[PDB]
Curated annotation (Swiss-Prot), chain B:
Mg(2+) binds at E253, D277. The modification Phosphotyrosine is found at Y93, Y131, Y158. It comes from Oryctolagus cuniculus. The modification Phosphoserine is found at S25, S85, S88. This is Pyruvate kinase PKM. It comes from the Eukaryota. The gene is PKM. The modification Phosphothreonine is found at T29, T176. The lineage of its organism: Eukaryota, Metazoa, Chordata, Craniata, Vertebrata.
Length: 521, 512, 519
């Protein structure tokens, strides 16, 4: 017979078990890819020529990691991202908006530099003694006997018996003795130690500021450089989010704050954090050191579920395709991890070392793109929609009603897209929350709306640069036709397919109160 | 306390839904289930018919088992006189449909005056025309000439609504023994359950009657004793080209009609569960199975289904119904019947207006008590093979109406089709269907929730203006009828352009 | 064609289930819904009662709104004579329960005067004076109506509605006198003698349990009745009053609260908690509240009783036309079927058996409709939903019941055999709604009679002495159930049944479940 595209046979299952049993490797996914791809920029991906290829390969958001680098460095990276992005601007039908994200240092603890003498890294051997010092005379003279770190109040928050993790939690030490300003430890889990490695104190109430003087400088720079969003590190409570918001101030009021959940306190206080934030990142690197690694999937699924329920963006991050730093193909676990994040409901997925420093940045981007489309088709939309509807049923909001009606109609007629005209993005955000399988082409004259729309599953932002037409009906038609041309050019649909179109009836309509089923011309 | 059983609406399971049903949760003003009333001596006057309309009658049923063409022509005239007496007010005028219910392949006795048949007593059944008007305790004439070729020894014969039963002892005559006795009058109905009755689907009389229906511009035919698709097509062929727009509603009232239901449904415009004859032809204890199966399959198909017969039977003589009758009406609405019907209760009873009024009250209560969220999900699942664009518009619109608790869906339609597709997905809110087609308006009563409104205004030159005119009319109707007030929200379905072939445009609109 | 609506049973959705219902899918022999019959002039002879038992009657209801203790004692005697006429064969013997239905706080009119017509016509718009003067208690007419509620004027106001004769006549209070009410007829009709009066707007202050009710309840204790149907229960305290009157001697008599007024519906949860079971008393309920709302109360009450695992009875006018006709109306067929689908443990007959021309036909029709509707239940969904509702409980017998019912669905078992003395284990199985009959073998005769309150429990009395070896005593009782099932045509050799027993004499419940072939 005919093998339906986009796992549509599985779509019709009555139970989740039957849905899984019907998944078919010979069911081709659609062309559109709904899951946003966020790429960390670094030495491997920094050039204008590489960035153009990154955009072509699927990058939607460029992440600048302020744990390292000067303002000069980051300004140059941002410049290059914008040069690459605008190189495509001559064709408004094919131009893709690209967002810029600033990821804060936050309250990090780091070691110093390994001493010049001897091997490049020192071996910390199981059972050996290691003294932790705060004496700056050692800040560039760390070795197998004495380790300097930059957290001055460390002795006030740890106890005898405390565990100290170093280098992505790979080395572990146990505190044996406390001095006034030093710690005598025993190496519990040994390994080779390099310079400026991350330190975690999972047992401790670390008392560094949520927003340091450095972070304030960095956030202010972000406002000056017109970044679209901030990924705020180590958010523990709503008050931390409010602090970031206050620093961004009036000038930065439209910059979106994505709180990174990466410690136990952030998980415990998740609901209040979500309420205060514009979205969330599941920051799995630190999270899986701060809590037992075998528990991370619980936090990931809980956080993604709760964000989906709230209609707020959620990003899955860290080690998704880690082996691709050195290899041109991912492991089977990595393929599975990306697919399952998409199935979980992540709006965006992220690359870190894979794009920042790795040997195969373009291949990493391309692989996220391929896996995302497969997993998107494999979602159980009918059930997901019912469950989202149930969760939000206390709300009688009119835009939610239009969004739900439009998504339902899109399922029924297998629409090739939903076209949404929006200035603030809000109407498109509501459609995205209800998880259509078809792409959402959001036409906007607001350039920042376009860049920020990448935070939401399925929104394909399109910037309209045409002046406003005097007649509302003509201005609406102009923008709808732009989406039709974009969709055709991108291969999302062709003449004779059907799309759902959401518009405002009048210029003063406060949301898209008008839904049409329209054939593609 | 939330109105309209909205607390129960939010339940996760069917059991929790039932547990939340609340006698103190008031229904809405709108009543979605169509009410079909049989017209007879108790209800035939223009004066009574006006009160019938005011009380909620949507369809007037003329039963052609009895009465001359002259008689029925006069009844039809009176229905139209009563209906048109309200025509000058476009905001309150209610269209009223006219339905012709055929005699069909009935078996009937002759003329007796009454006769007592007692248990054990012998009764001879004859076909000799010399006894047509000479029926008594010993000799009964009936009009089915082939009865002997079709019954066997031991076969049961039911007379007078299945109340009298006879068992054939020997076989142009039949000698029988009276089992269930009783007083027998003239020209009573006869049933032969489990016999293959070979009377024509459409008799010479039925042909005359159907041609009369075309002449009289009836809206629909209720075709008696439909056994198969071919029977429906025989009716359709008589109605012919001139009658092509008359809706054919097949009556399921025998075993074969139930067995061959799917082909009958395909061939028909809608269905009636004709429970009177059905409950004689099959064991009475099985009728609810047939009722639920038929209503479910009609709902699945989006074709009108009517529940009929003895729904409020005791109201022929009493001003209040029994508890079983209240339950029956509620449960038919819960099952999903588009329309419910009255027969003797309105045709000959002492309390016709009270019967109509009671159907109205029960329907509103039961409509609120449906489990719309689950019903919609299940209807969507059943029709998922279809990608129809109007179905998509309908489902999106109904979904939106649930989400924002819209007070109505307004649908602009000429053929009715867009409104029919909204009705099939079972919104809780009323569907105000504005049409310039008067026959569309009358026929719309076959569908749950459609409140038809005739627009008599000239067509405006500008499409947007003509659309607004019709939407405004619906707003005025809804306000006047107490369905909504300024500030409420409604879902509005229109065509984007005059050329659009369905309502491809949906809006959420505040009531002005 | 699959029997027992088993094709419909496999549906994924409620709509699909309905679409699959098949008139050619034969029900099983067993009938699970209990049948309660009101005994009266048409049904109180020993010979008729034997036929009523044969036709399916499980509980004989004595209506104490009428009749003397002498009368009811004679009826009870006859019920027992008929019941025990079958006792010589323990394989076929059917236990029959006796229920006492109280008068409660009724209001009734007096006798129509001797002169003039038998009934008087109360015409719309006409005046009618209500009096409490006993000089008129047997002299009621179209001008003056006596009634027996001495405090009526205290609870009614000008404008109040007064309903008479099953709510068929209505009056509006126009003037209040010290001991009288001037009314205007609103809904007219013909008025006979000793007709029921309802005051839906009023806080009627008659005692829940009158001096007469106390005498009647004590009489019920002395006569060893199995259950009491307590009229007009408005609150938990009313139930406690009845319980106190029954006292220590009557502590094992089951109290079924009749819900028949607005307050009873409002205070339903506390009433259910205090009661052993519930009756939806639809006659009075549909006068006290708008008749069009009764189905809401019925479905809510049945649902909540099902969730609690407490017996619920649907009552009143189920087959009303059969008082005079040998066949019911289509609405009546529908009503019975829908009560069973709703989840009623028992269904009831009133005038149909007490005074009608066709009492046996009425019982037989309830039997036929019940079996058809039982098969048409959506058991898979019902079980899921009941399990969901009770999931806060981790009770061990509930776990055995759910496991046993689940197993019964999976292997299409022909019965669940349950060995029980108190009935508790069988009651928990019934609560989870298997499609197969529950054959409950008990040595406690009162347990057997009371088991009729629960859907699907087919009680069987074991009269054999206790065997010394527990395993042999268990086998003896299982074998009795096997013999009963075979004799009744529930199953034959080679079919499969689920058997629930205690592992040892001291097990407090049936902690042992087996899948067993019928020998
Ligand atoms: K960082
Ligand atoms: K007819
Ligand atoms: K009583
Ligand atoms: Mn981190
Ligand atoms: Mn018929
Ligand atoms: Mn009562
Ligand atoms: Na070194
Ligand atoms: Na918007
Ligand atoms: Na249309
Ligand atoms: Na008299
Ligand atoms: Na027990």
């Amino acid at each position: 017979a005919f093998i339906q595209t986009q796992q549509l046979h599985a779509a019709m299952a009555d139970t989740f078990l039957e849905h899984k049993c019907r998944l078919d490797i010979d069911s081709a996914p659609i062309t559109a890819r709904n899951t946003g791809i966020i790429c960390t920029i670094g030495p491997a991906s920094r050039s204008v020529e590489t960035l153009k290829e990154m955009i072509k390969s699927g990058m939607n958001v460029a992440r600048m990691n302020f744990s390292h680098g000067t303002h000069e460095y980051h300004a140059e990276t941002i410049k290059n991202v914008r040069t690459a992005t605008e190189s495509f601007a001559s064709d408004p039908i094919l131009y893709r908006p690209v967002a810029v994200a600033l990821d804060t240092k936050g309250p990090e603890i780091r070691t110093g530099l390994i001493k010049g003498s001897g091997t490049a890294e020192v071996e910390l051997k199981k059972g050996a003694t290691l003294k932790i010092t705060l004496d700056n005379a050692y800040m560039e003279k760390c070795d197998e006997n004495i380790l300097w770190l930059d957290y001055k109040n460390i002795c006030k928050v740890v106890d005898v018996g405390s565990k100290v993790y170093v280098d992505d939690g790979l080395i572990s030490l146990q505190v044996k003795q406390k001095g006034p300003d030093f710690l005598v430890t025993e190496v519990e889990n040994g390994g080779f130690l390099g310079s400026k490695k991350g330190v975690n104190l999972p047992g401790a109430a670390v008392d560094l500021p949520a927003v340091s003087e450095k972070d304030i400088q960095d956030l202010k720079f972000g406002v000056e450089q017109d970044v679209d969003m901030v990924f705020a590190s180590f958010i523990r409570k709503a008050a931390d989010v409010h602090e970031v918001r206050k620093i961004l101030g009036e000038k930065g009021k439209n910059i979106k704050i994505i709180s990174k959940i990466e410690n136990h306190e952030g998980v415990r206080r998740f609901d209040e954090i979500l309420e205060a934030s514009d979205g969330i990142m599941v920051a799995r690197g630190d999270l899986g050191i701060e809590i037992p690694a075998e528990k991370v999937f619980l936090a990931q699924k809980m956080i993604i579920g709760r964000c989906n329920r709230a209609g707020k963006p959620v990003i899955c991050a860290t080690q998704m395709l880690e082996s691709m730093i050195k290899k041109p193909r991912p492991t089977r676990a990595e393929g599975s991890d990306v697919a399952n994040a998409v199935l979980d409901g992540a709006d965006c997925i992220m690359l870190s070392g894979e794009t920042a420093k790795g040997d195969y940045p373009l291949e990493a981007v391309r692989m996220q793109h391929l896996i995302a489309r497969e997993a998107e088709a494999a979602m159980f939309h009918r059930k997901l929609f019912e469950e989202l509807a149930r969760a939000s049923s206390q709300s009688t909001d009119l835009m939610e009603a239009m969004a739900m009606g439009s998504v339902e109609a899109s399922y029924k007629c297998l629409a090739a897209a939903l076209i949404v005209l929006t200035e603030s993005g809000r109407s498109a955000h509501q459609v995205a929350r209800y998880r259509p399988r078809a792409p959402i082409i959001a036409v906007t004259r607001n350039h920042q709306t376009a860049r920020q729309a990448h935070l939401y599953r399925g929104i394909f932002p399109v910037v309209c640069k045409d002046p406003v037409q005097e007649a509302w009906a003509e201005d609406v038609d102009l923008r709808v036709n732009l989406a039709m041309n974009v969709g055709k050019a991108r291969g999302f649909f062709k003449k004779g397919d059907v799309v759902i179109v959401l518009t405002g009836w009048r210029p003063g309509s406060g949301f898209t109160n008008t839904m049409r089923v329209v054939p593609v011309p």
